[PDB]
Design a protein around this ligand. Structure first.
Ligand code: HEM
Ligand code: HEM
Ligand SMILES: [C-]#N
Ligand SMILES: [C-]#N
Ligand SMILES: [Mg+2]
Ligand SMILES: [Mg+2]
Lengths: 110, 110
């Protein structure tokens, strides 16, 4: 079976990538889901408009990822997360998210 | 120092993702580059008119990637690569490519 990747792509106010990335430093349970393998948190370089941060999660299968989405740990990690558009979210630099899903056709680790 | 990711995004004619991914199975020298750590080749899951394949390379530093990009082994790996838009690109399903660069702010591997 091929590995699977899920990306959450954060659209952020200009300059807010760093303060946003720091929120991802301490784990909140994703690592306890069977089939979770790796996570990367990236800042897109050379952006001229909004900042862009991507959260890449690598899994044994799409099923594993779905299991995390359906978990209480997913809820607990996101319980205080607000978009700028939320009623109490005016101060958030997070404008929107978009999820992308991928089949990993090849992987190599040195 | 932060890890670094360079991505080559390929826009491909519909149905050609699988045949294109197979071209990346066999290494052509990138593994010999000091600082090279991982590579992923992905197919985006969606309902679009074109296929999309991304090549993600993970490095100890941006310097590492620059060394590879400017290397003889990079040149060799790509010497027979053509785009559909090229004069001799008749058999190529590759419509275009775009490079994206990222600082890796955080990484976790189970
Ligand atoms: C609904 C929109 C979402 C927004 C605005 C958002 C943003 C955030 C933020 C700000 C954090 C850190 C929270 C904190 O300060 O403690 C977080 C946690 C996290 N998010 Fe999201 N997120 C969303 C949904 C998703 C989705 C769909 C994914 C799938 C890739 C994802 C992946 C992650 C991961 C892997 C963590 C860390 C989880 C852990 O350590 O257990 N998020 N998210
Ligand atoms: C100029 C546009 C490019 C196109 C159309 C392209 C497409 C391709 C193709 C089709 C292959 C496999 C060739 C074969 O059949 O042997 C390949 C090799 C490869 N490409 Fe690209 N590529 C381009 C530039 C880049 C860039 C900028 C990167 C940076 C991430 C990259 C990353 C890779 C990697 C890691 C390999 C495998 C190299 C090895 O194993 O040593 N390519 N590319
Ligand atoms: C969460 N991204
Ligand atoms: C090369 N992608
Ligand atoms: Mg900037
Ligand atoms: Mg502007």
């Amino acid at each position: 079976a091929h590995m699977f990747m899920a990306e959450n792509r954060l659209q952020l106010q200009k300059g807010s990538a760093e303060e946003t990335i720091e929120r991802f430093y301490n784990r909140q349970g994703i690592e306890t889901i069977e089939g979770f393998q790796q996570m990367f948190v990236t800042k897109t370089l050379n952006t001229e408009d909004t900042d862009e941060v991507k959260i890449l999660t690598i899994w044994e299968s799409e099923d594993s990822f779905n299991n995390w989405l359906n978990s209480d740990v997913f809820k607990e990690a996101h319980k205080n997360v607000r978009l700028k558009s939320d009623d109490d979210g005016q101060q958030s630099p997070i404008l929107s998210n978009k999820v992308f899903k991928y089949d990993i056709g090849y992987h190599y680790q040195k």
